[PDB]
């Protein structure tokens, strides 16, 4: 009670009742109800000075006793925006402590799982840390480590996937490598769980972010699974980042000029996106001829079809089509003597309903060709089929 | 984790051992029957070469409402083991005709006495089939067709009935 | 007496609440304990059972068996993590009794809960009469969330009710600073 009463007024009314619930839920031990108002609370952003004493006060006592998600989840939210990255390494070594002090040995019966899995979030927090510590090298190796773990665990149950995803995607998004954040977030979003979307805004910026590498990534060259995924209507309304959406809209399509004045107009909304300026026009070129190609079809191409289409001169076609070759984009061989662009299979696209019904009819002619062929067969060797 | 499901090899003695089962226990329709698939592992071809009958239960209702002793597990574990200590257990197969709802789940069940990834079986008792009535579902986890969260499900393996000097006698 | 029963523990977040010293999971693991050494010494004939109701859907522990090892490693080996889905536990309880070894004994299921009972009230009629349709008896053991299970348990009783077969015994023994098997030993039991 003493410090339950220190904490009672260093707080706001509305958050009273809930150290009411804490203080009679610690009378005969139901403290699973009380971390369930504690995340209640916890999420809450009326929790700043919350955050900061009562759970160094409260789960100091509680913090054998209750599932370890909870317990470092609570201390996650009190290092959401403190900038004592020394002593915030120094509480997650803590942590690291106590839980190989805990879970050490002396296991009998009494449920529990001896917590590896509080274990990897706590380190994968550290990971994070180090990243906000300029730990670039050190981070990655501990990630590294991390992945390690992942591959034990036995197919490790949700949880500390989220947290280990988001760490690597914070540390592609630092370390300015689209291509990894790209994928690391679309698997973390994937594996997102429902239990918490954390802020809106966060996720907005999340998405704002995703959407800036999938523009800058390399390896990326078809934006329809960005645009028709959930993690888009983050901003599927707002018009801060509405720009970008257009942006994306006319890459899908390939305009060029509407391209062009929305490039100028937000190349100074970040220095990022103007110091690839020229790959963001490679990537409309490749646009380009990627959906020339599926639109017009047919093997073969011309030297100036591409050039109209993709707005650069005869001379510079050889280099682009350099590029899709060497991406994967195709597999196709070029041929300057005469100008007849040899096409082969092209990197596939999600299909939609029209195409299923052209597919159906093909599927029906062959399926008929080939009833026909075995009709003949069967009939004219009836002598010999046994 | 072993990736051992490009190959299965089913000799005709667990087949049969099945249709035996099936015809045994007097199983109307809607009534799967299920046993174990006792065989050898830890090789690429997986093979398949010994059963015996489970008693499992299930009524026609909610999916988790599905029995299965465990107890019987290990004790056929025993006996076979005092009979041929080569035989291990490699999974499981139920009497057919197709995938149901609870075959991921009951699969977990045989995690902890199976080493590797634990084998399905499909066996087409009743034999509406035209082609091989086996095919093999290992439960691997990959990620959704939909952009969706991992998804740990069974995959098809192309089955070949084969058998040895024993059995093909 | 030649007496089958199955033991339906209870491994939920709730279960893990610790009102009776230390744990109501081990609370519930000691009554087990008692349970199993009374019907030993009753007929060493009859054989226990144990089914979790919690971690997921119910996860089955060990058949019908008389022997305190296998079950006992189990209880080691339950985590306490998901809900009470006591609706899909009656029922395999109830799959269970139609497999004794020995097919005279009796029906028995004694459930232990320790959360509310968020299931279908009909369905859950149904489950009641249908157990005592087969002649199943139940006990429930209640302590814990006692405002809200006790709604429901008294109906479950009502229910079944057997006035001349085995009458099922209800307990909803508040918690109190006693040892809690002594508490069931007596009420319920006989």
């Known amino acids: 009670d003493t410090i339950l009463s220190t904490l009672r007024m260093e707080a706001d009314p509305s958050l009273h009742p809930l150290f009411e619930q804490f203080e009679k839920f610690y009378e005969e031990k139901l403290w699973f109800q009380l971390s369930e108002s504690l995340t209640k609370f916890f999420d809450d952003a009326k929790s700043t000075p919350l955050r900061l004493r009562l759970y160094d006060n409260f789960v100091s006592k509680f913090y054998d006793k209750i599932n370890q998600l909870s317990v470092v989840k609570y201390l996650l939210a009190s290092l959401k925006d403190s900038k004592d990255f020394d002593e915030s390494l120094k509480y997650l070594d803590d942590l690291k402590a106590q839980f190989q002090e805990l879970d050490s040995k002396k296991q009998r019966n009494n449920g529990s799982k001896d917590h590896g899995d509080g274990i990897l979030l706590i380190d994968s927090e550290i990971a994070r840390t180090y990243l906000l510590k300029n730990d670039l090298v050190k981070a990655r190796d501990l990630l590294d480590d991390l992945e390690k773990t992942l591959d034990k665990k036995d197919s490790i149950p949700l949880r500390i996937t989220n947290s280990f995803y988001s760490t690597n995607s914070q540390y592609f998004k630092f370390k300015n490598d689209f291509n990894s954040f790209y994928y690391t977030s679309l698997l973390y979003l994937s594996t997102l769980e429902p239990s918490t979307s954390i802020t809106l805004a966060e996720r907005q910026q999340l998405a704002y972010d995703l959407s800036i590498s999938a523009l800058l990534g390399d390896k990326i060259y078809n934006f329809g699974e960005l645009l028709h995924h959930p993690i888009m209507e983050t901003i599927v309304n707002d018009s801060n980042y509405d720009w970008l959406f257009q942006l994306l809209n006319a890459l899908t399509v390939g305009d060029f000029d509407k391209f062009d004045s929305l490039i100028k107009v937000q190349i100074s909304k970040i220095p990022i996106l103007a110091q690839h300026e020229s790959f963001l026009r490679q990537k409309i070129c490749l646009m380009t001829l990627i959906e020339t190609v599926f639109v017009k079809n047919i093997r073969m191409l011309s030297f100036e079809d591409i050039s109209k289409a993709t707005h650069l001169p005869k001379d510079n076609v050889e280099h682009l089509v350099m590029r899709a070759i060497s991406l994967g984009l195709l597999k196709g061989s070029i041929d300057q003597v005469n100008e007849l662009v040899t096409i082969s299979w092209v990197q596939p696209r999600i299909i939609s309903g029209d195409q299923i019904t052209k597919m159906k009819d093909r599927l029906v002619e062959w399926n008929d060709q080939v009833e026909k062929l075995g009709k003949k067969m069967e009939a004219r060797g009836q002598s010999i089929w046994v | 984790m072993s990736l051992q499901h490009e190959k299965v090899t089913i000799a005709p003695l667990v087949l049969l051992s099945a249709l035996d089962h099936y015809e045994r226990t007097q199983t109307k329709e809607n009534k799967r029957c299920v046993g174990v698939i006792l065989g050898d592992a830890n090789s690429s071809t997986i093979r398949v070469t010994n059963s015996f009958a489970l008693p499992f239960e299930e009524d026609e209702k909610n999916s988790d409402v599905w029995f299965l002793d465990h107890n019987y597990i290990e004790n056929m574990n025993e006996m076979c083991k005092k009979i041929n200590a080569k035989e291990k257990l490699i999974g499981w197969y139920h009497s057919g005709p197709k995938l149901r709802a609870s075959d991921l789940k009951i699969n977990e069940l045989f995690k902890k006495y199976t080493q590797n990834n634990p084998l399905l079986l499909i066996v087409d008792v009743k034999q509406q089939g035209v082609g091989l009535p086996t095919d093999a579902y290992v439960a691997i986890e990959q990620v959704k067709d939909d952009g969706t969260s991992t998804e740990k499900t069974f995959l098809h393996l192309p089955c070949t009935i084969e058998a040895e000097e024993a059995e093909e006698i | ?190």
């Not at chain 3, 536990?89 to 320790?114: E, G, S, Y």
């Not at chain 3, 001349?164 to 002594?182: A, C, D, F, I, K």
């Open chain 3, 1 to 190: 007496v030649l007496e089958a029963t199955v033991l339906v523990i209870d491994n939920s977040e709730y279960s893990r609440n610790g009102d009776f010293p230390r744990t109501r999971f081990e609370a519930q693991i000691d009554s087990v304990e008692f349970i199993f050494q009374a019907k030993r010494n009753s007929n060493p004939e009859n054989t226990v059972g144990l089914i979790s109701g919690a971690g997921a859907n119910p996860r089955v522990l060990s058949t019908f068996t008389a022997e305190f090892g296998k079950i006992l490693a189990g209880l080691h080996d339950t985590q306490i993590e998901g809900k009470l889905h006591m609706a899909t536990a009656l029922q395999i309880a109830q799959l269970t009794l139609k497999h004794r070894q020995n097919k005279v004994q009796h029906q028995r299921i004694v459930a232990f809960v320790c959360s509310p009972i968020s299931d279908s009230r009909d369905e859950l009629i149904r489950l009641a009469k249908t157990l005592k349709k087969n002649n199943v008896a139940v006990d429930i053991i209640n302590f814990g969330e006692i405002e809200q299970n006790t709604e429901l348990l008294d109906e479950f009783i009502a229910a079944v009710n057997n006035p001349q077969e085995e009458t099922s015994h209800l307990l909803t023994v508040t918690p109190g600073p006693r040892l809690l098997y002594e508490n069931i030993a007596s009420s319920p039991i006989i």
